[PDB]
Amino acid sequence: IIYDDLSKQAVAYRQISLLLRRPPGREAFPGDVFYLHSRLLERAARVNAEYVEAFTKGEVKGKTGSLTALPIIETQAGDVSAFVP
């Protein structure tokens, strides 16, 4: 899965958040901005066969599932030290 402009997502939370009067943090993003990406990205993982068997209810055995992710982030003036990057 290749999310495009995860940055363009973060700008959108700020709007829904500032429209909800939630206090902004560094720059103008709300403190929850780390939770937003952390809970989205953490789903990309490789799971052992036992989890697959438990989820499938025994239909699939001995196979490990996986989900690779390639998030894209856009930096102003090549500044890798910005908040969101």
Binding site: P23, P24, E27, A28, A77, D79
Partner: protein, 284 residues
């Protein structure tokens, strides 16, 4: 204080960059003038070389201490150096090559001493602690042979009285605008390869008063011309090195300015955002 001082630092770096940009062109023009002087210098030296070759390699062959080979027990150098800074590593490269050769001669147990042109060599070799017998400084542009007459006179006095057995001139060579090389070449005894001729010494010169004193004066004037030409060429090489160093310095300043501007812009945005968050929060 990004809002207070970084804006001043940027301006200072801009001013320094413009000054270096001007210095590069000044050096480039002085290099052309030094090239003209250097090209003017050669024909007198080559004509005197032709005359000394005729006198030495004529049908009747004379012998002179400045000309005859002598065994080595002491070795001497005279070194040219800049009187002004910048000019990159020219001086240090020349000095370390001279030190390499001096160490090579020391390993053979040969005592060495130096004659010095320019204050940079004076300072470096005083720090090294090498024997310096003569010094001349403060020529700047348009150096004169009249000042040079001294050190060459004392080095000649050392050479002909037995104190010195070989003499080298240490200087950088103006190969071209883009490249210069530190070099060492022999002056005494006369290293020039022999030559042969028929017209000369057949329709021989009438000698007044006698051929020998004229040969002594001729050889002295020749070595003096050699060291003057070396000095001029080293000055031209200095100008070229300064031009290059100023180009590098201007590029470095131009590279620093943009990073300072990026930092200043980050600070500028951050201050506005913080102060507006404060204003909005204060309206409870």
């Amino acid at each position: 204080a990004g809002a207070k001082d970084i804006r001043s630092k940027i301006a200072s770096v801009q001013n320094t960059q413009k000054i270096t940009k001007a210095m590069e062109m000044v050096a480039a023009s002085k290099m052309r003038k030094s090239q003209d002087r250097m090209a003017a210098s050669r024909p007198y030296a080559e004509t005197m070389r032709k005359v000394i070759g005729h006198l030495a390699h004529g049908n009747l062959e004379y012998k002179h201490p400045y000309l005859e080979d002598r065994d080595v027990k002491r070795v001497g150098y005279l070194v040219v150096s800049t009187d002004r800074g910048l000019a990159g590593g020219l001086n240090i490269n020349l000095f370390k090559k001279l030190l390499a050769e001096m160490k090579t001669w020391t390993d053979k147990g040969v005592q060495a001493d130096l004659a010095m042109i320019g204050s940079k060599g004076v300072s470096f070799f005083n720090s090294v602690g090498g024997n310096v017998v003569a010094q001349v400084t403060g020529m700047g542009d348009n150096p004169s042979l009249s000042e040079l007459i001294g050190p060459v006179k004392v080095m000649l006095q050392a050479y002909d009285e037995g104190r010195l057995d070989k003499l080298y001139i240490v200087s950088n060579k103006f190969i071209n605008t883009m490249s210069q090389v530190p070099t060492i070449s022999q002056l005494l005894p006369l290293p020039a390869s022999d030559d042969d001729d028929l017209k000369h010494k057949s329709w021989d010169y009438l000698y007044e008063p006698d051929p020998k004193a004229l040969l002594d004066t001729l050889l002295r004037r020749y070595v003096e011309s050699q060291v003057y030409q070396g000095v001029v060429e080293n000055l031209a090489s200095e100008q070229a090195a300064r031009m290059v160093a100023m180009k590098a310095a201007t590029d470095n300043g131009g590279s620093l300015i943009k990073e300072l501007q990026l930092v200043y812009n980050k600070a500028r945005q951050a201050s506005i955002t913080q102060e507006l968050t404060e204003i909005v929060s204060g309206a409870a």
